[PDB]
A paper describes a structure:
The MERS-CoV ORF4b protein is a viral accessory protein that functions as an innate immune inhibitor and strongly localizes to the nucleus, despite virus replication occurring exclusively within the cytoplasmic compartment. The MERS-CoV ORF4b protein has been shown to bind preferentially to the nuclear import adapter IMPα3 in infected cells, thereby inhibiting NF-κB-dependent innate immune responses. Here we provide a detailed, structural basis for the interaction between MERS-CoV ORF4b and its innate immune suppression target, the nuclear import adapter IMPα. Our results provide a detailed structural basis that explains how a virus can target the IMPα nuclear import adapter to impair immunity, and illustrate how small mutations in ORF4b, like those found in closely related coronaviruses such as HKU5, change the IMPα binding mechanism.
Because HKU5 ORF4b had been studied previously and shown to traffic to the nucleus, and an analysis of the two NLS domains between the two viruses revealed only minor differences, we examined how differences could potentially result in changes in the mode of IMPα binding. The NLS site also shifted, with HKU5 binding at the major and minor sites with the same sequence, RKRRRHP37. D Crystal structure of HKU5 ORF4b bound to IMPα2 at 2.2 Å resolution and a comparison of MERS ORF4b bound to IMPα2 as per Fig. 1E. Our data confirms the results from an earlier study which demonstrated that downstream “site 2” basic residues are unimportant for HKU5 ORF4b nuclear localization. Indeed, despite the complete conservation of the downstream KRR motif among merbecovirus ORF4b proteins, these are not utilized for HKU5 ORF4b interactions with IMPα2; rather the functional NLS comprises the mono-partite sequence 31RKRRR35 which was capable of binding at both the major and minor sites on IMPα. Intriguingly, this monopartite “site 1”-only NLS has been shown to still be sufficient for the inhibition of NF-κB-mediated innate immune signaling.
Residue numbers in the entry:
A (entry chain A): 72 to 496
B (entry chain C): 31 to 36
C (entry chain D): 30 to 35
Amino acid sequence: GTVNWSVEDIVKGINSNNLESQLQATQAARKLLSREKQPPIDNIIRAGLIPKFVSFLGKTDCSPIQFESAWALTNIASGTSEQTKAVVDGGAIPAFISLLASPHAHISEQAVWALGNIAGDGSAFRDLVIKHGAIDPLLALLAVPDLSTLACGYLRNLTWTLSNLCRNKNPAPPLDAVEQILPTLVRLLHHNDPEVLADSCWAISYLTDGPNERIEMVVKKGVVPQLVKLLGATELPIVTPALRAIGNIVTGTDEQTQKVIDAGALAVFPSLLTNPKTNIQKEATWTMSNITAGRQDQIQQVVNHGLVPFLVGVLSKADFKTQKEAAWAITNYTSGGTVEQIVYLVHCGIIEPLMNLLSAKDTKIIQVILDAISNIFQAAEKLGETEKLSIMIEECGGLDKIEALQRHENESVYKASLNLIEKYF
Amino acid sequence: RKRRRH
Amino acid sequence: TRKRRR
């Protein structure tokens, strides 16, 4: 019937003044644009069919053509930025926002999907969708006593579109829009569907990726305990965005980091720092590095949770990027920690892996490791045990690495190695 | 990101 | 600060 039409036939049908022929041609276009391989989006655009689809979006008396044109425009807007721009230039944003209130659930769902693609293009189209007033009807769609009454796919599409309205920076979403959306985001973060939870966590991670004021807007809503609970989930698609958000939050003030700590997040890091997924380990180690850059009582809470041995383990064996994040964590620990905490770190066996990592080609990790070594040496001096630390570094083959680093291209590494050797070796 | 309906 | 954002 409407399978495998040519663009010529689709154009001939849509250009007829027969609404049923137009509907059949629009469905043929939808089916063409829904094929797995090489959807002819550019050909459909060159034929000048976007204005006709946008006009069909407004035929309240023919809901089937509304649905077919909405699906076709959704698939066009899912492509490159130029194709999404073609959809937007056809005037599709206000038409989709009007369809959001359609009495037909599938048409409203398709409008949500299309707006999600458009907003997901980038900050400009995100803010333009917001200016046309999409947030109010979108949130009204979710104004129900219990989210479980809504169709699953419908709720998933709504959550994903809301996440795209929270996405992207330079600039970040409008503050009034973020405040308008956050309550519903919290409610969705307490929903039970794995995909809804994943997309809500992604939205929260987008919102927490910014200055301290954005992080504060998020944490004021009291979502940190739920974020930690989800950090403990078994589905990796949930743990990933939840860990993302928790790390973002700990990049802020010491009080926000303390909110993360009080929620019990540290107790999850034994698993996260040993997680089979390399990305989880890297994100967890970066989060730990930002937590060790906090107050001394926060470093002490890291110690009490037994996480220093896990940092030693990550430093000893892991992907190189995770090892670099662990080196950063150790350097922050030593810069902010007390003498007792630093000597405890030494007692856990940090010297040997920290020295083995000095054979890396990355210059920044060398600088970080040398700074950590200098801080540990300052602590030892404060205790008068600098000779013990010197022999400890010599026994694991570290003094040779430092002497070799004296002859390094970078000036900072040169000077740091020279100073270490002249002052302690 | 974007999603195409198949 | 020693804190590092992404």
